[PDB]
RNA sequence: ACAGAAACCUCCCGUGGAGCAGAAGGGCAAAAGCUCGCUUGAUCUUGAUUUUCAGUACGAAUACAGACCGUGAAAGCGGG
RNA sequence: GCCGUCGCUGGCAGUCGGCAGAGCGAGAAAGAGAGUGGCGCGGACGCUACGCCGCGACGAGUAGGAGGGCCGCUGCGGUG
RNA sequence: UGGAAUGCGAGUGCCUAGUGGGCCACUUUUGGUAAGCAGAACUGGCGCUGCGGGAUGAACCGAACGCCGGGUUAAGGCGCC
RNA sequence: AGUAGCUGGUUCCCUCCAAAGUUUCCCUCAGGAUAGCUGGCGCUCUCCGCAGUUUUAUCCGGUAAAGCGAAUGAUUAGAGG
RNA sequence: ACGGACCAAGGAGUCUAACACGUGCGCGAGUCGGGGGCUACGAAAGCCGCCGUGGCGCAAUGAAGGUGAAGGCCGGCGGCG
RNA sequence: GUCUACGGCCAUACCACCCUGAACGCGCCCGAUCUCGUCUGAUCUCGGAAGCUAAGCAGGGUCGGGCCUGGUUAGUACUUGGAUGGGAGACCGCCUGGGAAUACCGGGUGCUGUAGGCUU
């Protein structure tokens, strides 16, 4: 029941990234912010949540 | 790519996907220099895709680990085989550096192609790094340090922290 | 900012009747109470129908109430209407009926009472069966109004049996070009 | 006095402001268009479907009486499994009473 | 925002900047996180992050 | 401004493939269509009678009528704001039995089956299609030879 | 043989490189071309449908249905 | 934090008082039901129900539309 | 076992104003030597729209607006203004 | 108080929704009618359906590329008969 | 680009007929006296039904002459077969 | 094994040349009174059965042409989306995904349905 548990959660509203984005307009592999940062999502979560 | 911070020296292996035809394909090790493993796997796929008929989807990364230095307390002489593009054409190079780490010398090579040739971090393609014996080096900027009794003074010691005494009585001294 | 669209944010249902009469605004008070304080979805339908305009709650005929209360099973039930119960002069026999409507015309009170049926009101019904057990909700034909014959596909269009707006109907009032296969065409 | 000649610029957005909706898929679609001779014989089939009624019950009630001799012939851990049973408002009423009595 | 990226950022319920949601991965999901790639920064959450 | 010709812009759409000209095969005419068949349109240019208009070539629809040499089908047409249900009398040579519904049918019968069974053994089988899930964990045996080492090649101005 | 670059006869090769009234495109080989035989489906009459489209007309067109017909041993094909 | 709009087609006639017994926020469809046998005389507010109360989400705007004005002007029937 | 995933209450009916001069941008694109030129396609904008940046600015980058306090950012920046 | 498809004006607040310069026809091109987009009033149900989305099957297409020792058309050079 | 020195007062979607939809009200297969008549405000209000003539609604369709809105089972008789 | 009639997909079946075909058939062949048709019994139609696999036809062959299917070409060309990337531009690199076509080099060279024969 993942569909139902994840849909019971109102989508989280997070603050701005404390410290600040690297570059919003370019992929994470381009030294930016967008895209998939597999392991490193938690470093962003701690400074955003 | 973007040569952020100091580059790490990563050892990535990876293989194509298992199929009915090739029940097990050969593994393929590469030697990537990148800020972090997320960029190292992406340059592993850039290269493997430029060499083998193999894509990120059609394959998989078997291991992506950082390889440390075997003697980070010995000054070494690294020689690198570049491959980059200018506004008009693309050229191979060979540059030498004195450093303690291989990833250190590669960071210094990215900052050096950036300084001298204005080559952004994505045009460059390191193809071979090798620790060279001091008697095989070629660049005179690196051979000049191969002296046992080296000796030189720091002749013009420009005053830093110009603003802590910002308003002072005495004038600064540069001889030391 | 959020990227939602407020095109349909305002639901247009009737929160209350538009009339200002006080024998309806008291029924709507009693049934708004029953509607919220009971778990019977009957009162909620009666309340939602007491709001509706005079064109959305149409009249019932005595004959249509006959044939809708003669259906097997629904004997000894009270036929609830929210509009009015008009007469139907083209029916000769009338049974006994328990009825509850807002109005009953002075020639349908006669027939129903001479038959021997009861004519309740909505307050009498609310006292007889609060949750509305033993009832039969009805409503007259809504597309009966002559208005609904001009609606649909516009006339002069392949297979659009829609009535046009004409001053008078006759030989020489919209019968010439878009109707004759001879003169021009027809749809 | 030359004016712009033709465009479709805003059109693909006006189309979607009220959505692009597939038509109303109803069961029992109309029979207009079907060939005459066939749709003429289907009407003769319906017009006479009643002609075999008193014979149709003789079989529906037959296989419905036979429905009698048809059917009447065949006729994660022990801990969190016991706690999820004591904590049942109905099923655990007596395992709960057995505990309430436990402290006397 | 493009219309194809605005329909997917609203089936991911991300109707607002810095909104976040959880997403289970498969082919049909990764192929949407590829469509909306320039608008999101997604990854694999730790247990402490959840 | 273009012309409104019935066949403007069909030089390639209605042409026959390479080395597939000439007489049309007869399996085209000896296969059957019954009201409800999901049929896809592909205008063949050899036979000219009953050719579907170019705006339907490549669409799919369902049959609702059948005459001697032709059926009538109901294809959806996107018209400038909306999707009408249009009824066209396409001749038989401009039709194929679309094998799209087919796989759904061969999955329906496979479900009705696997539900008939697994009902006496009390077990529970999976009847839904699940998306290709993330691949599970495995060991990659490097039996003997270590991974070959790759490296970029120098540049060669082979122009 | 006269006969020539080119008349007419004959064998061979010939996927269409010809022809199908016209512009181009598509299609066409025991044919849709060429030559004969018989003919007038280029007739009468309902609605449906497609094309342009507003999804209105006209024009044109596709599927039938009812008659009467032509052709052919027939299956069929034909209401330009 | 405050204002407003929208939604919950939300809640409140239960102010049921010495003719009394003060409840319906709690994870689990349904009765704090009936009968049948083994001293001190006391208890805030509310409810113009077109009223009052509680919850969330939302808040740009020309042309245009709609609503609400215990906004304003002059006279008329009532009423202060 | 309501037969892929994710999301979201939908369906329908009347009456209807304004509009029917548009312009700009990435990419594709026709005429032209080209044009702040003429002409199309897709999406996003300006028009109807403030705000931070680009000294300045219809259209570029960020980001869309009830009135306020604290905190953090985007795009841009950090000798002095 | 002649007509004007033409010019200029068109009077109080707040709240809510919010465009178009596009289609077809017109002695139409400074204007209309029409479809679109908009608002208003609702109603029928909910308390299965739908989607500017992907997945999996399944058709469709003649652009980018490529080709001329493959048809059409263009076209350089030798060599062997 | 045009109007605007200043201030006061005046100043622009009105009324009638027709139509359509929505809405409130009375009666409801009926409905309505609007014309006529009878009995200070009052030129109002009330009343008439043998004043409902007539309008609209209750029947459509055809150019018209005209026609004008479920049936089924059962026996008994004649006819075909 | 294989052939005849009618076929299905219509070159893996087509084209050129060569070799072998037992038996039944399939054919060539012999005639023109009758059916029918021509300049012509060549074709067509008709009545036959002395002759023969010569040919059609079948099978096989060819460092065969073609066709079919693979590899290389090539993660190349091209390409969806992205950047306050580079360049004066022309264009180019990179991230995220998809991804071709020659030349060149390999393999294959008809499967099959119903009915009826031969191989007793
Ligand atoms: Mg800080
Ligand atoms: Mg951008
Ligand atoms: Mg907001
Ligand atoms: Mg708005
Ligand atoms: Mg215009
Ligand atoms: Mg022939
Ligand atoms: Mg016929
Ligand atoms: Mg607003
Ligand atoms: Mg104008
Ligand atoms: Mg322009
Ligand atoms: Mg201009
Ligand atoms: Mg304007
Ligand atoms: Mg706007
Ligand atoms: Mg803006
Ligand atoms: Mg500037
Ligand atoms: Mg602030
Ligand atoms: Mg500054
Ligand atoms: Mg005037
Ligand atoms: Mg609205
Ligand atoms: Mg004008
Ligand atoms: Mg003007
Ligand atoms: Mg083309
Ligand atoms: Mg090209
Ligand atoms: Mg002027
Ligand atoms: Mg002036
Ligand atoms: Mg004034
Ligand atoms: Mg009315
Ligand atoms: Mg032998
Ligand atoms: Mg002979
Ligand atoms: Mg031979």
Automatic annotation (TrEMBL), chain A:
Localization in the cell: Cytoplasm
Subunit structure: Component of the large ribosomal subunit. Homodimer. Interacts with DHX33.
Function description: Component of the large ribosomal subunit. The ribosome is a large ribonucleoprotein complex responsible for the synthesis of proteins in the cell. Binds to G-rich structures in 28S rRNA and in mRNAs. Plays a regulatory role in the translation apparatus; inhibits cell-free translation of mRNAs.
Entry similarity comment: Belongs to the universal ribosomal protein uL30 family.
Protein name: Large ribosomal subunit protein uL30
Annotated source species: Oryctolagus cuniculus
Taxonomic lineage of the native organism: Eukaryota, Metazoa, Chordata, Craniata, Vertebrata
